[PDB]
Design a binder for this molecule. Structure first.
Ligand SMILES: CO[C@H]1C[C@@H]2CC[C@@H](C)[C@@](O)(O2)C(=O)C(=O)N2CCCC[C@H]2C(=O)O[C@H]([C@H](C)C[C@@H]2CC[C@@H](O)[C@H](OC)C2)CC(=O)[C@H](C)/C=C(\C)[C@@H](O)[C@@H](OC)C(=O)[C@H](C)C[C@H](C)/C=C/C=C/C=C/1C
Length: 119
């Protein structure tokens, strides 16, 4: 189980009342960055689609739909919370990384994650 192979720093507090449980479906805005500061992915729209059509990432939590660091971190977050996650390679894409997805081998990944809603 532990200790966790990720760290969480809370950037914006959530409601501190509604926490996702394993099997809940969550919705999030995220930005993913490498240790060098390069943004590798984001689902946050720059403009004119900021609200018009953009859809947040949707997944069922705690069941291995996402990398381990996200799955465990989400369980610690409350609705509306914005957090910075630093995730070791072992709880991300492993030692090999995911080159076809732009993730280099053996690199920590930094995500800013906002938990919008829980179903
Ligand atoms: C264009 O953007 C991509 C997301 C990209 C992919 C490449 C990575 C770098 C990245 O840039 O995201 C990224 O930033 C990243 O690493 N992410 C994304 C955000 C959550 C954390 C992490 C992740 O785990 O991605 C995930 C990672 C890449 C793959 C998983 C890693 C954990 C492993 O255990 C899983 O095995 C199952 C596979 C991708 C996802 O977040 C999507 C949502 C989830 C899946 C594809 C799987 O759960 C899949 O098979 C179960 C499903 O059940 C889904 C719902 C089926 C439906 C049809 C697919 C929808 C696909 C949406 C794809 C999206 C939005």
């Amino acid at each position: 189980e532990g200790p966790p192979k990720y760290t969480k720093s809370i950037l914006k507090k959530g409601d501190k009342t509604n926490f996702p449980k394993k099997g809940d479906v969550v919705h999030c805005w995220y930005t993913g960055t490498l240790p060098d500061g390069t943004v590798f992915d984001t689902n946050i729209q720059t403009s004119s689609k900021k609200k018009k059509n953009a859809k947040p990432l949707s997944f069922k939590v705690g069941v291995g739909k996402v990398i381990r660091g996200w799955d465990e971190a989400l369980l610690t977050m409350s609705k509306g919370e914005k957090a910075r996650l630093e995730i070791e390679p072992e709880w991300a894409y492993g030692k090999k990384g995911q080159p076809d997805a732009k993730i280099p081998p053996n690199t920590k990944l930094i995500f800013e994650v906002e938990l919008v809603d829980i179903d």
